[PDB]
Amino acid sequence: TNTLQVKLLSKNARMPERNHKTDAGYDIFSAETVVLEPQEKAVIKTDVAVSIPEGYVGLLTSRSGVSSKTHLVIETGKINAGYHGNLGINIKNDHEDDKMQTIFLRNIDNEKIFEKERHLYKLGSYRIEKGERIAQLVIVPIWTPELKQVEEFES
Amino acid sequence: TNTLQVKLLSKNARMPERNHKTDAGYDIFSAETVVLEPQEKAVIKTDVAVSIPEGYVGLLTSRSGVSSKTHLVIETGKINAGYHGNLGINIKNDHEDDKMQTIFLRNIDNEKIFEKERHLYKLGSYRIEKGERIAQLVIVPIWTPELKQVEEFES
Amino acid sequence: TNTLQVKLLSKNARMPERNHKTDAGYDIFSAETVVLEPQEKAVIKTDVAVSIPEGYVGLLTSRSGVSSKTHLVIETGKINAGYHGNLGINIKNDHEDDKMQTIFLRNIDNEKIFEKERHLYKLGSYRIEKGERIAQLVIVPIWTPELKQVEEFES
Ligand SMILES: O=c1ccn([C@H]2C[C@H](O)[C@@H](COP(=O)(O)NP(=O)(O)OP(=O)(O)O)O2)c(=O)[nH]1
Ligand SMILES: O=c1ccn([C@H]2C[C@H](O)[C@@H](COP(=O)(O)NP(=O)(O)OP(=O)(O)O)O2)c(=O)[nH]1
Ligand SMILES: O=c1ccn([C@H]2C[C@H](O)[C@@H](COP(=O)(O)NP(=O)(O)OP(=O)(O)O)O2)c(=O)[nH]1
Ligand code: NI
């Protein structure tokens, strides 16, 4: 009743966490490791499925720490009450494509990642790693009345 | 009561649709045909008016299919309970302006549109056509208490 | 009960305003004066703190007038029920960095600001001034049930 059904779709999926009763949302973890170049768009698999009951909508939205620090822009997803598919993260690396190149990409804390092997990445490239806090899920009640075409409003 | 008032403002306006009782929102259709160049901003007319009752807010928000596939970024609009004006779609083609040009623009499914007449468009240009599913409306309850200036919080 | 606690953190902070009972949100004012260059990111201090009660989330979101007219993109912040810190505005000037320069920057109405002293700014630069309407706060009820790992959903 006052419980939400969560299903893991793979071994790479992590269970959402609401560590504090103070918090409004549930920590969503990536089930993928991907490198996003400037201007590049992607849908990140969480390998998690939720069964939101009717009368509610789920908001798969961005964290403030990742969005303020990095150019990673997450378009909030509206999780329909009944959708049992894989929760994707609609993401875009909004860093501009200035043609410049660097020897290291940066994490979701905007910090430079030092590698043992030298590699040439385009400047402004980010990497998201398996099991990282990149999004959060917030469930909000909704009002869905029947629509009535009207020629001029009540008042 | 448990009905929402909808008004069409022209012949080009289409009635919002909630085809499934599973869905949280209402399909919003464009009343315009416009071509958006890279970095170009616009407010798309739906020619639709809604009368949301007090204690609720409307969220004129993006669809997941259009936002994940195209560079079309819709800034979610907060529809105030009482606003009876034309619902606009605050949109931006976030494709970068790389000065390059192509012989065809692309639709809201990111597919290339083949034309009988050759025309030169800038690379990353999109066209939205009259009567297309580009946005959705989600109504959510709101808490609007009176504000009290406080020197230090309750607890 | 049906009141919200608001705390000012400095002399530069302004009290949020819900001028109409028609409106869904509360007008949020900047406590800073900053110039944002193209592609530049910042967190704007409001010097305001709110004590949202449990069972609710706050949405520190963009105004339609500023977002449709300017390239100022505000990533909606989810204000947790219990957070008593400074409300920041997660902002980005999404104007592209075209290397061009102009003798005047522009305001949150996208109008050119004429100065007595000539200065060279990069094209697409915006200035936000102390005490300006740049954001709004909308509080929405939330459902936070306990999570139960499930192998296959109820129905
Ligand atoms: O724009 C913002 C966003 C967040 N905040 C505050 C409110 C919130 O309680 C706190 C945490 O931000 P979020 O709830 O949006 N994300 P999260 O709880 O995951 O924190 P973080 O992103 O830092 O891990 O920061 C702002 O003041 N302005
Ligand atoms: O980022 C997202 C967005 C949506 N989804 C899922 C949840 C939702 O039930 C389903 C449909 O997405 P939206 O409700 O956000 N838009 P719409 O119902 O119109 O579908 P589409 O945009 O594909 O027409 O896709 C994700 O998993 N991640
Ligand atoms: O995309 C939008 C955004 C807003 N609107 C309408 C609905 C709303 O009642 C009205 C005001 O917009 P917002 O509530 O989103 N922001 P605000 O009340 O502060 O007005 P403004 O931003 O113009 O000061 O404009 C649209 O039609 N489409
Ligand atoms: Ni939102």
Ligand code: NI
């Ligand atoms: Ni951009």
